[PDB]
Design an enzyme around this catalytic site. Structure first.
Site, short mmCIF file in Angstrom:
data_model
loop_
_atom_site.label_atom_id
_atom_site.label_comp_id
_atom_site.label_asym_id
_atom_site.label_seq_id
_atom_site.Cartn_x
_atom_site.Cartn_y
_atom_site.Cartn_z
N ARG C 17 8.61 -24.80 12.79
CA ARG C 17 9.55 -24.81 11.67
C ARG C 17 10.95 -24.31 12.07
O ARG C 17 11.96 -24.86 11.67
CB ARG C 17 9.05 -23.96 10.51
CG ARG C 17 7.86 -24.52 9.78
CD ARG C 17 7.28 -23.45 8.87
NE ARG C 17 7.03 -22.18 9.56
CZ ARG C 17 6.76 -21.05 8.93
NH1 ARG C 17 6.73 -21.03 7.61
NH2 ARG C 17 6.54 -19.92 9.59
N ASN C 35 5.11 -24.98 6.01
CA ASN C 35 3.73 -24.94 6.46
C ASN C 35 2.86 -25.35 5.29
O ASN C 35 3.12 -24.94 4.17
CB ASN C 35 3.33 -23.54 6.95
CG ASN C 35 3.61 -23.35 8.44
OD1 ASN C 35 3.87 -24.33 9.14
ND2 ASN C 35 3.54 -22.13 8.92
#
Ligand code: MOO
Ligand code: MOO
Ligand code: MOO
Lengths: 88, 87, 84
Positions: C17, C35
């Site tokens: 990320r 996520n």
């Protein structure tokens, strides 16, 4: 300890202020990248002349999303204090 | 977590930020800290394989700093960090 | 335009990320890398069709820590590119 640069081309809305601040930080510089009303980006950076020289090289030739047409060097004798490398 | 002592021309040259960036990109947590003697101390937490990758980077990754030596200190520290701090 | 990419593989706890958000910001994009409970990562990005293709290229082939197996192209103002 600070030098100002004026960067022209397709340089706004293309990640240029972000990437410039990132590169400045990796060089241990402080300062800012600012969108100007005429489409250019103003970069002020503070540190050693050698570091500022690398930054100027990167602005011209570094891998980046922007399409830089011109990097103009303005004063190199600016006396400023910045804590990080801000996007403005 | 492992601890690495990096010596050389390593302060005032973007090393803590660049280190934090390389650590975050590896999904590591920990910190880069300026030491008073001019060294930088790096603690990183992750799998042994990712920490080795950070070690390669500390030694040889393109960076502004001039790294003289990367000292492997403890590798079995049991810390918890949320991010990768510049300290 | 906006686009959504569902990324699967070894993609959580591996800097995916952060690196994705860094890559988007370098591209001038806005959005997020989230996520998901199932282990996927959901990337949403907004900008030009051309800049979005560049993100997709990166998701699939860009150097990174994560081991991406598949990148799903799916349909879709964010400030910045947020981690979660
Ligand atoms: O499109 Mo930017 O120049 O990081 O705000
Ligand atoms: O010039 Mo730094 O990136 O806080 O070590
Ligand atoms: O180590 Mo990550 O960049 O929070 O998905």
């Amino acid at each position: 300890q600070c030098s100002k640069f004026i960067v022209s081309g397709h340089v706004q809305g293309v990640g240029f202020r972000y990437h410039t601040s990132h590169q400045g930080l990796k060089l241990g510089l402080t300062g800012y990248a600012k969108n100007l009303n005429n489409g250019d980006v103003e970069v002020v950076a503070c540190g050693t002349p050698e570091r500022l020289e690398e930054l100027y090289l990167w602005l011209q030739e570094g891998p980046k999303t922007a399409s830089v047409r011109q990097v103009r060097r303005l004063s190199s004798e600016l006396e400023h204090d910045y804590q990080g490398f801000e996007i403005l």
